[PDB]
Amino acid sequence: VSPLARSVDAAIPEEAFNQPPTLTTTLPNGIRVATQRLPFHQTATVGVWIDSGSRYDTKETNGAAHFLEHMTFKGTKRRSRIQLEQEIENMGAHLNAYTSREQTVYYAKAFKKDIPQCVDILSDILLNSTIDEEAVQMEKHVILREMEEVERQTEEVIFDRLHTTAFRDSPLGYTILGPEENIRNMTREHILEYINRNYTSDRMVVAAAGDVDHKELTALVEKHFAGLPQPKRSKIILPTEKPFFCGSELLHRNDDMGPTAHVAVGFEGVPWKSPDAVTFMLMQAIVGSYRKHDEGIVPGKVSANATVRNVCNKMTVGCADMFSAFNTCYSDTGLFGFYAQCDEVALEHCVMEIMFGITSLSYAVTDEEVERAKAQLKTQLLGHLDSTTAVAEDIGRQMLAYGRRMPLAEFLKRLEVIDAEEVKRVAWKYLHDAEVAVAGLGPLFGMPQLINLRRATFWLRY
Amino acid sequence: GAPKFERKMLGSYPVSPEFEMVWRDRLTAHGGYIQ
Amino acid sequence: FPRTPDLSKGELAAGATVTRTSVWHDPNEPAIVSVSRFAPDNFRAVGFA
Amino acid sequence: PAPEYRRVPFVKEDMEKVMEEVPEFKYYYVGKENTKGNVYEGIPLDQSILEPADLRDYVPPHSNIQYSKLDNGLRIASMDRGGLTASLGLFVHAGTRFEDVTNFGVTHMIQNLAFASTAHLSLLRTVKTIEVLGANAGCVVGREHLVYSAECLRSHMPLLVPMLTGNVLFPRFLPWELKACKEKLIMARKRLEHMPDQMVSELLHTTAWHNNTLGHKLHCTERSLGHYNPDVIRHYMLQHFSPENMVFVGVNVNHDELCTWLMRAFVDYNAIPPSKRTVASPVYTGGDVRLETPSPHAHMAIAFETPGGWNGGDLVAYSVLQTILGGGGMYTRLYLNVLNQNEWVESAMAFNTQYTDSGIFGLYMLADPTKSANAVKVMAEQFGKMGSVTKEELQRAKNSLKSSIFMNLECRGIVMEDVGRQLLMSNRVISPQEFCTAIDAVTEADIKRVVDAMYKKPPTVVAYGDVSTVPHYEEVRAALRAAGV
Amino acid sequence: QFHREIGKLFASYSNKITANSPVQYVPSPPTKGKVRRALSSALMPVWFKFFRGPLDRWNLAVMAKYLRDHGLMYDDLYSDKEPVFARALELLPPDIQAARFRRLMRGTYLNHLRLYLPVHEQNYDPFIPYMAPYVEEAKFQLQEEEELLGYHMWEGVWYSGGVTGFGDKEPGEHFLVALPNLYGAGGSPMQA
Amino acid sequence: SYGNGTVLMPIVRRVFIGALVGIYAYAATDVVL
Ligand SMILES: CCCCCCCCCCCCCCCCCC(=O)OC[C@H](COP(=O)([O-])OCC(O)COP(=O)([O-])OC[C@@H](COC(=O)CCCCCCCCCCCCCCCCC)OC(=O)CCCCCCCCCCCCCCCCC)OC(=O)CCCCCCCCCCCCCCCCC
Ligand SMILES: CCCCCCCCCCCCCCCCCC(=O)OC[C@H](COP(=O)([O-])OCC(O)COP(=O)([O-])OC[C@@H](COC(=O)CCCCCCCCCCCCCCCCC)OC(=O)CCCCCCCCCCCCCCCCC)OC(=O)CCCCCCCCCCCCCCCCC
Ligand SMILES: CCCCCCCCCCCCCCCCCC(=O)OC[C@H](COP(=O)([O-])OCC(O)COP(=O)([O-])OC[C@@H](COC(=O)CCCCCCCCCCCCCCCCC)OC(=O)CCCCCCCCCCCCCCCCC)OC(=O)CCCCCCCCCCCCCCCCC
Ligand SMILES: [Zn+2]
């Protein structure tokens, strides 16, 4: 009867249900088009999402997929390098691209009136690019330089080394750039072979968001993407083998690069379509992140996150400069773990504290911790869907992974019914007493043994 | 333990008591290595 | 919800009886001024001097 | 043409009835009533679990800005785009430009004491409850404005409003809390030293407006610690933190609901009373300053004054000129005429910093520390030709500027900061459609007119890094005078 | 799912407390029963006159004479080993802290000699509560910390970092973490 | 309370009290009731 028991208990806000639909169509040649109209915008983002990457390179030509990225902006039959650059500038538009292990993306940002001219440019550079042998030799100097700057961003180097040792027996372990000797001996014939084997109509999605009309985007695509080859099958219906996960360590000791070490640990995860994928997203948020030079308004020593609290109070001074948990999904496997930076003499304490927090998911996590993590996850995910680019990336990425876009209300309904007993079930099945892979760099004299890390995945209490 | 010129640490975090013997025998990896 | 101190009788106001009561409201002063007089150094028991 | 504000009157309400409207909130979970578990176990994400009762016909929201005002003078403005994460902000017209020799550092102190103990909530319970809600909040100090902000799920807005307004309504300023914050108060400028770009900017302001208004520093110094006591702080808030000097803004909220909860935060207690203050006009002096530091590059910056600032009448002209030259692109004047013709230049750009009634405009370059004398000659030559542009350059700049504006305003945070910042500086919000109409009306004569006026006052020169070959003050001034500057 | 059923019982009893919780101050109910409050009031005029009354008066005389012999106040008898009182002492202003320091020094010296003060140095009331405002603020600070951080039995790494792992933060205060080093010159936790 | 590792003495306290309540209840039922 107390007013303290008549509070407004609205689980999922009504705004989650009153969202504009994402419209989809499949064309005769196999290209898929997907659009969501956001009336409160004057600009728009349109792009092409392709289901190919470094994992679809050959061992002898690892690196052609990234090489092709650069050459796609060097000239066509109807436009030259200079002409392409000037046309974009004269409209005030933007044109970007990136390549990963399983997905490749090209997108543009411009006004509504300039959308057709963007679709024309995207189809041309993707289907009619001239791979001049003379330009292939010039780029070799711009790419060998990028391999030196990438070696200066340490976090990117550590995650590559983590893929190299974990997936030794699969193309999923290849690097995106490729070895040096492959870059030096690259020819235009290696690049054309990658195109003819990977860029087909069944592996491409066109997505848009903003002040966009669906029927008009479906007619422009039907006209400009007609010269796209269809898949050829030689009566071969053989399935792909799931990558094998190797428990191993790969460490670069170096006492001449300062007092800070860098480390990353990984577990075998789950693929996109797994019935347990949502729970892995949540488990990533329970471990969370921390930066010593950017705590915010909550001091780390009194944080609600148990992992942060234990790390900040270690030896009364704190044992980490920063750490963060990650979860990455692929088509047939995944990768779950954490990255960290720390002082030479603090490395052992730091790594073992974060391991202790992951293993707590199987034994002792509380519903207060789960609901704190849920609230943070919702604020970040739902907050990043503001611009037209982030929305378009969400459409395209989901069309390749799931075959559809999940509405916001469905995600929130699936996230709502996950409690502490369901977290314990999933962690007991996948993370408890499991194999781990490790990569590291720097002053590593105090690094734990691989077997120490392997046995920290279970407790002897209980 | 190790000689003084090898025991010198690069970091500043304090040595924990369970690790006293580890750091009494610190040795610099002259030239580096990959394991 | 603790009991509200009666300042007219000389009762002490400190801790929870400042934060969770309206004892510090004054109609003819801004709130930032009134509550500045309710720190523990502002009170002294009769007979102190 | 100021906007028309709707009135929201104070109303007395029964406390027990208003509690039926507070959103549910839990800190403890003592058992659980539901016992059904994960009802979607075993179902993969390529399959949908929604039902027909979860489908709706979309109805667009109210995306225009709505305006309202309370009886104590607080101005309110909000807009709804249909998102699920809201942005909230409280803007106060009380920046470092209002400090004096007995107060330097007070605004920085108030920023670092944000979300401390108030009359009805302690420090620990305030920061711990925000975290458990999943929100982020903070306070940022500036030269003209102070801003408190938070972001959260849009159903938690009523819970976050009091934790924002309490900082300006009834803070306590307890001694032992001031003594625990004194550490982080000095580490700010220390962390600023190892940030070259931020140090060059500070040096530019301290040198442009010598010992007045916009030239005061942002952060405290060891000298400031001599007046770090509650009485000095509370005296500063009584002069500047009245409701008439504040604006509240929200994005992805219901306008009427935001007004109701803001009214309830102010109805039972007394706010700081208004006061008449006279705003001193800035005095631009220019000058020169050097700062040697270990670095492989020689940082150099040269600037001039912009008369009138945001309200001078030529804001759009300076933003078009900035786009022609090049900011933070491969057909800009600085990329073609400077970078490509000199391999010893590492970077170059143009900046435009405007305030309510004054601003500066200039260039910023990094270069080889052995060719600083040549860096000065190239910068002077660019200033000598700034007042001349071609039709192709001008037309390409306009198109680039319009696109940037609309694109920037796709993000919640930028929209909130722009609306609040405009209502304090001009009591009006200029739409992006009105900016475009103004951009299109910029001519070649306007450019040439504003560059000449810019050069009627002395320059402001700054050098940072390795300054072993940087010419003498008189030589920099002379080089500019030979190029017609 | 046996854990979810037990959680339903806890939750039912929890919701009942909340639905019956008042939203304003209400006096606490009488502790003693009516049968006990009737015998006491009937025997009061005789029990109080000849026993309980003189017991109360002797007690205050014994306390006052001992404190005055040593020049002490009653509140000087509390220890800084109590967490609440330790926090209260940290909040004191200089003038009150200095007078307490001096009285404690003088009282240890007088107890060592076993010599009374003269009568004219004993003319003061020792029962003035000079610590009360600081004690009530300390209680508020520590009750918040306990409710916001100490509502669960947390796990931890055992015998790591100088502590046991069961909740202690200051190192070397339990026997199974005694003797931190065999070699060296040791060190102080206050100089980390 | 939060911050210290005195974790066995609170258990000893509850066992001792319970033991006393049982000793003096087993004697009364044998002598009185
Ligand atoms: C008449 C004859 C009668 C004789 C009878 C005497 C009794 C005989 C006992 C035989 C026991 C055999 C089984 C041994 C297993 C030990 C436990 C274990 O698995 O350790 C894992 C433990 C942690 O494993 P991990 O891989 O690091 O981490 C995995 C998880 O991630 C970590 O997950 P987590 O964080 O949840 O786990 C933390 C870890 C806690 O980890 C720690 O922090 C360290 C734990 C301490 C080391 C393990 C205990 C054994 C140490 C031997 C001490 C002997 C002293 C001899 C003095 C004799 C004086 C006469 O948890 C524990 O293990 C807690 C302890 C469990 C409760 C106690 C039961 C085990 C005690 C075994 C006997 C010791 C007491 C005997 C005293 C005799 C006095 C007369 O391993 C270590 O610490 C590494 C070194 C271990 C050395 C083991 C040596 C065994 C020898 C036992 C015989 C005792 C000698 C008696 C002499 C009598 C003469 C009269
Ligand atoms: C693996 C090898 C094979 C054999 C393995 C054997 C088993 C090993 C693992 C066993 C389980 C380990 C995990 C324990 C629970 C941790 C839970 C947790 O994270 O909470 C942290 C929790 C702190 O939570 P908090 O809220 O921050 O503070 C709680 C407040 O202080 C007070 O809060 P409050 O006032 O609300 O009171 C709370 C109280 C409410 O409950 C009650 O009051 C109920 C009272 C029931 C009375 C009737 C039943 C009898 C209970 C015991 C009576 C006293 C026994 C005294 C024994 C002394 C000698 C050991 O809760 C409890 O009583 C729960 C604790 C019950 C467990 C005790 C027995 C099992 C654990 C024994 C220690 C583990 C081995 C360490 C070995 C180290 C070797 C180097 O810490 C504990 O409660 C720790 C309890 C365990 C004792 C500490 C370690 C003692 C070390 C010295 C003895 C070493 C002997 C070695 C040789 C002999 C062989 C072992
Ligand atoms: C070192 C520098 C100098 C140079 C080097 C020196 C080198 C030499 C040093 C030694 C080197 C070797 C290492 C030795 C290790 C020894 C083990 C050790 O250190 O453990 C410390 C360890 C404390 O570790 P901690 O790190 O300080 O704190 C632990 C927690 O983290 C935090 O816990 P907490 O702080 O919350 O509470 C801790 C508290 C926890 O307190 C308790 O749990 C209570 C313990 C005492 C209970 C008994 C006392 C009387 C109580 C009333 C009667 C009760 C009757 C039973 C019924 C009860 C109701 C059901 O413990 C104490 O108060 C400490 C008491 C000391 C016990 C030491 C005994 C060791 C074993 C040998 C026993 C021999 C007995 C002979 C006499 C009897 C012969 C018939 O102590 C224990 O927890 C073990 C308790 C063992 C109790 C045994 C009781 C036996 C007698 C029971 C009564 C029977 C009456 C029958 C009458 C029949 C008439 C016919
Ligand atoms: Zn590249």
User: What is the 3-state secondary structure of chain A?
Assistant: CCHHHCCECCCCCHHHCCCCCEEEEECCCCCEEEEEECCCCCEEEEEEEECCCHHHCCHHHCCHHHHHHHHCCCEECCCEHHHHHHHHHHHCCEEEEEECCCCEEEEEEEEHHHHHHHHHHHHHHHHCECCCHHHHHHHHHHHHHHHHHHCCCHHHHHHHHHHHHHCCCCHHHCCCCCCHHHHHCCCHHHHHHHHHHHCCHHHEEEEEEECCCHHHHHHHHHHHCCCCCCCCCCCCCCCCCCCCCCCCEEEEECCCCCCEEEEEEEEECCCCCCCCHHHHHHHHHHHCEEECCCCCCCCHHHCCCHHHHHHHCHHHCCCCCEEEEEEEECCCCEEEEEEEEEEHHHHHHHHHHHHHHHHHHHCCCCHHHHHHHHHHHHHHHHHCCCCHHHHHHHHHHHHHHCCCCCCHHHHHHHHHCCCHHHHHHHHHHHCCCCCCEEEEEECCCCCCCHHHHHHCCCCCCC
- Quote the CA–CA distance of C23 and C38 in Å, as a whole number: 10
> Where does residue A288 fall: left (phi above 0), alpha (psi -120 to 50 degrees), or beta otherwise?
left
Map residue E53 onto helix, strand or coil. helix
Of F1, F5, F7, the CB nearest to E150: F1
- Quote the CA–CA distance of E153 and F11 in Å, as a whole number: 14
Of A2, A3, A349, the CB nearest to E20: A2
Beta strands D85-92 and D246-251 are antiparallel
Largest CA-CA distance found in chain D, in angstroms, rounded: 84
Ligand 3 atom closest to residue E168's alpha carbon, by position in its atom list = 31
- E 108-147 residues with CB below 8 A of F? 145-146
Ligand nearest to the CA of E180: 3
Burial of A233-245, coded b for 16+ CB within 10 Å and e otherwise, reads: eeeeeeeeeebeb
Tokens found for residue A191: 């690049």
Which technique was the structure solved with, according to the deposited record? cryo-EM
How many C-alpha atoms does E134 have within 13 Å on its Cβ side? 20
Contact assignment for C32 to D272 by CB distance below 8 Å: yes
> For residue D130, which of D215, D25, D273, D253 has the smallest C-alpha distance?
D25
Contact assignment for F2 to E146 by CB distance below 8 Å: yes
Burial of A170-185, coded b for 16+ CB within 10 Å and e otherwise, reads: bbbbbbbbbeeebbee
- How far D14 CA lies from chain C's nearest CA (Å)? 16
- Quote the CA–CA distance of A238 and C19 in Å, as a whole number: 71
Running DSSP on this structure, what letter comes out for residue D343? T
- Quote the CA–CA distance of D203 and D186 in Å, as a whole number: 18
Hey, is the C-beta of E4 within 8 angstroms of any chain A C-beta? Answer: yes
Angle at the Cα of F16 from the Cα atoms of F13 and F18, rounded to 5 degrees: 105
Q: Which residues contact A401 (CB under 8 A, 6 or more apart)?
A: A272, A273, A329, A331
Q: Which residues contact E33 (CB under 8 A, 6 or more apart)?
A: none
- E 86-125 residues with CB below 8 A of D? 90-91
The answer to whether the beta carbons of residues A17 and A84 sit under 8 Å apart is no
Please identify which residue in the block is written with the tokens 């995600």.
Answer: A411
Q: What are phi and psi of A108, to 5 degrees?
A: -135, 150
Beta strands A249-253 and A437-442 are parallel
First to last CA, chain C: 34
Q: Which residues contact D366 (CB under 8 A, 6 or more apart)?
A: D297, D298, D299, D300, D345, D346, D347, D348
Measured in Å, residue E176 CA sits from the centre of ligand 2 at: 15
Out of A14, A15, A60, A69, pick the active-site residue. A69
Burial of D240-253, coded b for 16+ CB within 10 Å and e otherwise, reads: bbbbebbbbbbbbb
Burial of D406-442, coded b for 16+ CB within 10 Å and e otherwise, reads: bbebbebeebbbbbbbbbbbeeebeeeeebbeebeeb
Measured in Å, residue E176 CA sits from the centre of ligand 1 at: 14
A216 is in an annotated binding site: no
Please identify which residue in the block is written with the tokens 């959680």.
Answer: E7
- Quote the CA–CA distance of A46 and A105 in Å, as a whole number: 11
> Where does residue A270 fall: left (phi above 0), alpha (psi -120 to 50 degrees), or beta otherwise?
beta
The answer to whether the beta carbons of residues D107 and D270 sit under 8 Å apart is no
Residues paired with residue D89 on neighbouring β-strands, in sequence order: D149, D249
Out of A87, A102, A139, A193, pick the active-site residue. A139
Handedness of CA E157, E159, E160, E163 (dihedral sign): positive
> For residue A253, which of A445, A410, A107 has the smallest C-alpha distance?
A445
Angle between helices D175-193 and D196-208 (to 10 degrees): 100
Does A69 qualify as catalytic in the annotation? yes
Measured in Å, residue A362 CA sits from the centre of ligand 2 at: 20
Q: What are phi and psi of D214, to 5 degrees?
A: -70, -5
Q: Taking the CB of residue A380, how many other CB atoms lie within 10 A of it?
A: 13
Edge-to-edge strand ranges of the sheet holding A322-329:
A289-291, A322-329, A334-343, A260-268, A437-442, A249-253, B33-34
- In chain F, residues preceding a discontinuity (C to N beyond 2.5 A) are none
- Quote the CA–CA distance of A404 and A396 in Å, as a whole number: 9
- Quote the CA–CA distance of D82 and E29 in Å, as a whole number: 52
A146 is in an annotated binding site: yes
Q: Taking the CB of residue D260, how many other CB atoms lie within 10 A of it?
A: 16
Q: Taking the CB of residue D474, how many other CB atoms lie within 10 A of it?
A: 9
- Quote the CA–CA distance of D325 and D330 in Å, as a whole number: 11
Tokens found for residue D44: 């993969």
Contact assignment for E137 to C1 by CB distance below 8 Å: no
> For residue D150, which of D24, D252, D259, D270 has the smallest C-alpha distance?
D252
Running DSSP on this structure, what letter comes out for residue D278? P
Beta strands A43-50 and A94-99 are unpaired
Q: Which residues contact D295 (CB under 8 A, 6 or more apart)?
A: D196, D464, D465, D466
- Which chains does F contact via 3+ CB–CB distances below 8 A? E
Contact assignment for F1 to E166 by CB distance below 8 Å: no
Distance of alpha carbon B11 from the chain centroid: 10
The answer to whether the beta carbons of residues A307 and A354 sit under 8 Å apart is yes
First to last CA, chain A: 43
- E 3-22 residues with CB below 8 A of D? 4-12, 14-15
Does A216 qualify as catalytic in the annotation? no
Identity of the amino acid at D15:
M
The answer to whether the beta carbons of residues A405 and A399 sit under 8 Å apart is yes
Tokens found for residue A415: 């996230």
Of D172, D238, D273, the CB nearest to C35: D172
- Which chains does A contact via 3+ CB–CB distances below 8 A? B, D, E
Please identify which residue in the block is written with the tokens 């992140």.
Answer: A289
Angle between helices A188-198 and A133-150 (to 10 degrees): 80
Angle between helices A367-383 and D123-133 (to 10 degrees): 70
Measured in Å, residue F20 CA sits from the centre of ligand 3 at: 21
D260 to D87, D255, E77: CA distances (angstroms): 17, 9, 54
- How buried is residue A316: exposed, middle or buried, by Cβ count under 10 Å (0-12/13-18/19+)? middle
Measured from CB, residues less than 6 Å from any atom of ligand 2 are A 460-461; E 153-155, 166-167; F 7-8, 10-12, 14-15
- Quote the CA–CA distance of E45 and E42 in Å, as a whole number: 7
First to last CA, chain F: 41
- Quote the CA–CA distance of C31 and C12 in Å, as a whole number: 19
- Quote the CA–CA distance of E77 and E69 in Å, as a whole number: 14
Q: Which residues contact D268 (CB under 8 A, 6 or more apart)?
A: C25
User: Which residue's CA is the nearest one to ligand 3's atom 5?
Assistant: E179
- Quote the CA–CA distance of A174 and A54 in Å, as a whole number: 7
CB pairs under 8 A between A and E: 44
The answer to whether the beta carbons of residues D384 and D484 sit under 8 Å apart is yes
Hey, is the C-beta of B17 within 8 angstroms of any chain A C-beta? Answer: no
Q: Which residues contact D114 (CB under 8 A, 6 or more apart)?
A: A297, D138, D139, D148, D167
- Quote the CA–CA distance of D70 and D381 in Å, as a whole number: 55
Ligand nearest to the CA of F23: 3
Ligand 3 atom closest to residue F10's alpha carbon, by position in its atom list = 36
Q: Which residues contact A380 (CB under 8 A, 6 or more apart)?
A: none
Ligand nearest to the CA of E172: 3
How many C-alpha atoms does A320 have within 13 Å on its Cβ side? 30
Of D36, D48, D58, the CB nearest to A21: D58
The answer to whether the beta carbons of residues D198 and D280 sit under 8 Å apart is no
Note the residue count of chain E: 192
Angle at the Cα of A171 from the Cα atoms of A168 and A177, rounded to 5 degrees: 100
Tokens found for residue A199: 């860029």
Residues paired with residue D301 on neighbouring β-strands, in sequence order: D364, D462
Interface with chain A: mutation pick from D30, D33, D45, highest number of A CBs within 10 Å: D45
Handedness of CA A70, A76, A81, A86 (dihedral sign): negative
Running DSSP on this structure, what letter comes out for residue E130? T
Contact assignment for B16 to E183 by CB distance below 8 Å: no
Please identify which residue in the block is written with the tokens 């508020």.
Answer: E140
Please identify which residue in the block is written with the tokens 């202690």.
Answer: E168
Measured in Å, residue A326 CA sits from the centre of ligand 1 at: 36
- Quote the CA–CA distance of A338 and A324 in Å, as a whole number: 6
> For residue D110, which of D214, D236, D245 has the smallest C-alpha distance?
D236
Burial of D149-184, coded b for 16+ CB within 10 Å and e otherwise, reads: bbbbbbbbbbbbbbbbbbbbbbbbbbeeebeeeeee
